[PDB]
Write a protein that binds this ligand. Structure first.
Ligand SMILES: C[S@@+](CC[C@H](N)C(=O)[O-])C[C@H]1O[C@@H](n2cnc3c(N)ncnc32)[C@H](O)[C@@H]1O
Ligand SMILES: C[S@@+](CC[C@H](N)C(=O)[O-])C[C@H]1O[C@@H](n2cnc3c(N)ncnc32)[C@H](O)[C@@H]1O
Ligand code: NA
Ligand code: NA
Ligand code: NA
Ligand code: NA
Lengths: 384, 384
């Protein structure tokens, strides 16, 4: 039918040892370490990585006494970089620290002498939330599948089923969709790409078989895979050099992997290494929570929420709701529903979503959205 | 009318001295320096900045002999950081260099022994292009206005009309729109935010007046400003500490400022510091060129183009065209038009858009899209 308007859409994800993701995990491990001692820590920790080097850079004002060497090295250990053969080793890498206090000019307008409920936005910016009824967790299939493919390789690396696997990995999933009055419905997998760092002992043919049979067929529902699905498995033919040795990594360079995989929209701000006063994080989280709550209320099938802030001002400047033609109520009526049911000041968001809890390292690989353990993934019951 | 579905939409931009943008400009100045000597330079230059420090990090394989100290210091000079009073000085800062050759495992699959036309994609990834008929340059008004507000402050800083202005600035523009069968039409400016670093001699009241009268009223068409427009001008009340001293900066952390300001979509990849073999850049540029050419052909009013790649493979894995209900031809018919009129292999894109030319530092502030001098902004005449 013409109404089905068949289309392709692609998303990617990366694994725990991808150098950009190493940085996000380290930045969030530093955040967590601070929050365990000082729940009101002001943290803006950037991490940069390259061969043999982790650099911490940014601004922290906190009463915590944090051993940055240990936090960094424990994180790299967890990811799996523990020997020179792998290109990176937690035991023997350089950890360099260039951390200062938060600017007093920022402190004075954001939080100094303020009541927590009316804490100012930590910066200006725009943030989006997105939800789709296409999966139970209200996320695009493309991004969820991409994440799970990386998680599966990590699981098989750690169990020793595929002991040639190294931590740096990338995946990409192209799904063929149909549409239904603005809603989207996955039909089949059009193309899958997987690139993963590996040892020098395993053959290409063996790696390719394992990637199809033990990774892809374990993760992707069988109904979506068919004879015409295209597989680009270890397309480079060789990925021995990997991690920070293959590619310099930086915090906040996987913004789209972290969120919706190309769906919805993004305001530009990174999540990792930032406490709740940074609306780049807290408001993006709340926006996701709003979007998901609207879908789970049965008020729409798909929705994009935009919010924005000025530095030092608690109240959002603007909130906008876009439902892709999938709501019976108007977008203006839904904005009234959101105003009646949510308070998107960061000092209220912190309460609703428990954002001083040291769970941030868990968010920094495999996506900040879609996973059931995070508070912004528990829909709020709406009155309307 | 119900059809007009009035809504708010917000975009931001930043100035030349914003620390993230300093990094993009430096990464692209390094790229340009290489290309002037070696048109086929392989460059993946990340820059990090913080108080007193510029760190270059990443991978370069090139026959060029580049003086990184001079390239960095000239760039910081140009931006305007030339004295300790400003928080940063090109003469006296630290420049640290951690640059290695490109991974041979990447080299061997991307370009080694290949014919230029069939050069492989430098990585996997997804990229979007976007165009809208709402302005002549086919860009959202929100983002164009945000860019111009920063450019205006830079102009007045350099001319000495407003000599208290320093290089680090941020702007944010919320426009009230109506819609027309999927197209969008700006009606009025709802909210403007401007924060700009300044000296210790100027009063807040004087800065606020100058920002409204000499910056905003000079840039925003008078018809869009009215008595109810909200102005958040120097909302922090004090922005003396700025640049890398106020906030650590990193290359590729202004991805949304660089592109469409929240409109369209983003695939996640940074532009700055990368040669054309990196499809994060070349394919995003070509995607913009495709989108703009479709609007300028009169085939749609608004359009989003997605393309994607696997590392080492020249041909895009998938191309998708979304017209928001604004095309008479189907999205499938338009994809046929795009296939007949464009070749989105990076080794053809490089030819069409002249991507070995050292013009990249010019792209690294004020947006990569919308400005008439870049080849991807000259629409291609379509046969259909
Ligand atoms: C291809 S590298 C990006 C470009 C790189 N900076 C360069 O110098 O060309 C980006 C990501 O791809 C993955 N990668 C690194 N080496 C690879 C290889 N040999 N084959 C496939 N993927 C690789 C890693 O996850 C890495 O972080
Ligand atoms: C507010 S800082 C980001 C948060 C920061 N890392 C912190 O520690 O809280 C982000 C950007 O806002 C701008 N900025 C820095 N100081 C500011 C101030 N005092 N008032 C308004 N904007 C400022 C700069 O352009 C800076 O790069
Ligand atoms: Na896992
Ligand atoms: Na073999
Ligand atoms: Na200018
Ligand atoms: Na005064």
């Amino acid at each position: 039918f013409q109404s089905m308007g068949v289309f392709m859409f692609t998303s990617e994800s990366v694994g725990e040892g991808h150098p950009d993701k190493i940085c996000d995990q380290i930045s969030d491990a530093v955040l967590d370490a601070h929050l365990k001692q000082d729940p009101n820590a002001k943290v803006a920790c950037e991490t940069v990585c390259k061969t043999g080097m982790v650099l911490l850079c940014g601004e922290i004002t906190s009463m915590a006494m944090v051993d940055y060497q240990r936090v960094v090295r424990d994180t790299i250990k967890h990811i799996g970089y523990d020997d020179s053969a792998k290109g990176f080793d937690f035991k023997t890498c350089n950890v360099l620290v260039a951390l200062e206090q938060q600017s007093p000019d920022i402190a004075q307008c954001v939080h100094l002498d303020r009541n927590e409920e009316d804490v100012g936005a930590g910066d200006q910016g725009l943030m989006f939330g997105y939800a789709t009824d296409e999966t139970e967790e209200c996320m695009p299939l493309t991004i969820i599948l991409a994440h799970k493919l990386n998680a599966r390789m990590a699981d098989l690396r750690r169990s020793g089923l595929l002991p040639w696997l190294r931590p740096d990995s990338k995946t990409q999933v192209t799904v063929q969709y149909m549409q239904d009055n603005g809603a989207v419905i996955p039909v089949r997998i059009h193309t899958i790409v997987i690139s993963v760092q590996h040892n020098e002992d395993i053959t290409l043919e063996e790696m390719r078989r394992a990637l199809k049979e033990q990774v892809i067929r374990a993760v992707v529902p069988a109904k979506y895979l068919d004879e015409d699905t295209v597989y680009h498995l270890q397309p480079s033919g060789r990925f021995v050099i990997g991690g920070p040795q293959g590619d310099a990594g930086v915090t906040g360079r996987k913004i789209i992997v972290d969120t919706y995989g190309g769906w919805g929209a993004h305001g530009g701000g990174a999540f990792s290494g930032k406490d709740y006063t940074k609306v780049d994080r807290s408001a993006a989280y709340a926006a996701r929570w709003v979007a998901k709550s609207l879908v789970k209320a049965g008020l729409c099938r798909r929705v994009l929420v935009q919010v924005s802030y000025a530095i030092g001002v608690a109240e959002p400047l603007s909130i906008s709701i876009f439902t892709y033609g999938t709501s019976q109520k108007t977008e203006r009526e839904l904005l009234d529903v959101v105003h009646k049911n949510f308070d998107l000041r960061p000092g209220v968001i912190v309460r609703d979503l428990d954002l001083k809890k040291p769970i941030y390292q868990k968010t920094a690989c495999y996506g900040h959205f879609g996973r059931s353990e995070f508070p912004w993934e528990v829909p709020r019951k709406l009155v309307f």
